[PDB]
Amino acid sequence: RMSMVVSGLTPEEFMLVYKFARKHHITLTNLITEETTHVVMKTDAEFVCERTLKYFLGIAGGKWVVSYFWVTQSIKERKMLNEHDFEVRGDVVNGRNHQGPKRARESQDRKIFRGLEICCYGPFTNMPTDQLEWMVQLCGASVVKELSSFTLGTGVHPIVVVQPDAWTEDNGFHAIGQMCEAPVVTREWVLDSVALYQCQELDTYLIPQIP
């Protein structure tokens, strides 16, 4: 029951991961799915990677997010080393030592977006909306598709997520308060939250809304 994907690897690097996967009877694919159990990141000597879509989605889904070093060493040592020893530890944006991968790996109940209701008010670069939505969902939000489809009532907090500089004729992303009763955060709020596997506070992401 092992499926993995890779991120930020060169073709030569992919091949080692291949050769590796071949040896340990591991399924290896291009696309991350729910069945993926591992994500192999290009990292530096101490397990800091860059932030990629798969990075996000493998944290979101509580998967093994491991250094490519997991691979090269298991090869160097002619046996499969342990993931715990190669678990990526940080990224170049969210800090070197935060351990999102670990946090998320364990906290599959205490799920960072519990009882939030998010709306990815499109458009986004480098990321289909539904991936962003899948991402918040793996993290326990529920996805509203439409500004008006919020489920206000008791207990349930709404959030509109946007990517300001993804807009054509912009500042329309300032007119969203006039369309409903939700905080409006940058996508960075989601990405940092997910990196850190810990729900950030909106404050530094809040987009100010024109009444």
Binding site: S7, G8, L9, T10, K42, E50, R51, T52, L53, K54, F56, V92, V93, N126, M127, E188, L191, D192
Partner: peptide
């Protein structure tokens, strides 16, 4: 700065 495969999500 280079980028080797997948889009990267960097400095805010």
């Amino acid at each position: 700065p280079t980028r080797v495969s997948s889009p990267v999500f960097g400095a805010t």
